[PDB]
Amino acid sequence: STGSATTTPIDSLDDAYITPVQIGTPAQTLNLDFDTGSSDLWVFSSETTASEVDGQTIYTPSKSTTAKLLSGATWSISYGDGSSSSGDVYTDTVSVGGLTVTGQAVESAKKVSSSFTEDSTIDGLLGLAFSTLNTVSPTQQKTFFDNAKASLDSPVFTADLGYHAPGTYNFGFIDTTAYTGSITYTAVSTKQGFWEWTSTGYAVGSGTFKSTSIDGIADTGTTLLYLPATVVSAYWAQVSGAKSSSSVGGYVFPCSATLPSFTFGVGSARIVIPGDYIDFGPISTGSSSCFGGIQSSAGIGINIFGDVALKAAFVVFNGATTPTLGFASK
After folding, report:
1. Residues 6 or more apart whose Cβ sits within 8 Å of residue 101
2. In whole angstroms, what is the distance from residue 111 CA to residue 215 CA?
3. Distance between CA 83 and CA 85 in Å, rounded?
4. Of the residues 126, 152, 174, which one is the last residue of a structural domain?
5. Beta bridge partners of 11
6. Quick one: how far is CA 54 from the chain centroid?
7. How many other β-carbons are positioned within 10 Å of the β-carbon of residue 173?
8. Contact status, residue 90 vs residue 83, Cβ threshold 8 Å
9. Burial 266-298 (b: 16+ CB within 10 A, else e)
10. Residues noted as catalytic
11. Collapsing DSSP states into helix, strand and coil, what is residue 62?
């Protein structure tokens, strides 16, 4: 089998991307944030505290003839941005772009933190990291990809995120028309549960490439590119007036600037992030200070190749017995 679904930016800055997902019988379609940095499929539901729902579409398990309570199971997750959610668990039928999994754990939110409530466009998350990170207790559950893998034509999914435009998640096949050149594959460590790999270096604009190993994760659920402070300083030093602001929470730059590109290495290959992809717009409405899309990871504990980097590439998440990542230009 295969599946193919369009993923759409939630706003004009590409802050996140939503993909429609069919849950239950008859189908209830929810727009989920596909997150290669986590491993829980959770949704706003008829169980979510009513004051914490503000415009999201909810899953109602009582209206699904295939829903079954997973007795005794609970879940609770906290994300890198400080947000969180928790609840109980059903199994139900879940389809993405024509690909169907029966018996998928659908984690029904009883509580969500304010950032989720405040984002009316995201109805939940669909995790695509390794199932060892799944938070369901006392019986850990598998991701949608893990459950589908054996049925897929090839044990892979791909992320093709757009810049200010829709893109595509494919399951089970590699669309050879969706990228230019060749795909360069690179080793993955699953030891932390992430699609963790090592970039071979970077360049700023037309500058020379610096060969240096940068361990980080491919994370579709993070908006920006988080890299070591040395690399990030070298980038912003090329933008007149750019500075790190503790009050804003990162690097800002004059909105009048033209930003340089940023290149990252994948083995001997190179992915170029155009400068415009690194502009996240005014820090507050009407400001002439703009927020940068490359930020320091020094406070995180890990480097994160988020959407800013991934949207510049066609990315293969290869879930073979030994997983690997592939990157192509497009």
Report:
1. 93, 94, 95, 144, 147, 148
2. 34
3. 7
4. 174
5. none
6. 23
7. 16
8. no
9. beebbbebebebbbbeebeeeeebbbbbbbbbe
10. 35, 199
11. helix
Q: Which residues are CB-contacts of 290 (< 8 A; sequence separation ≥ 6)?
A: 252, 253, 254, 255, 257, 279, 280, 281, 282, 283
Based on the domain organization, do 31 and 112 belong to the same domain? yes
Residues 135, 150 share a domain: yes
Strand-pair category, 184-187 with 324-328: antiparallel
Query: Å resolution of this model?
Result: 1.3
In which region does residue 200 sit, left (phi positive, over 0), alpha (psi from -120 to 50) or beta (all else)?
Answer: alpha
Q: Which of 119, 118, 172 is nearest to 144 (CA)?
A: 172
Chain breaks in the chain (C to N over 2.5 A) after: none
Query: Which method was it determined by?
Result: X-ray
The domain that contains 160 carries what CATH number?
2.40.70.10
Which residues contact residue 271 at a Cβ distance below 8 angstroms, ignoring those fewer than 6 apart? 263, 264, 265, 309, 312, 313, 327, 329
**Which pair of tokens denotes residue 166?**
């829709």
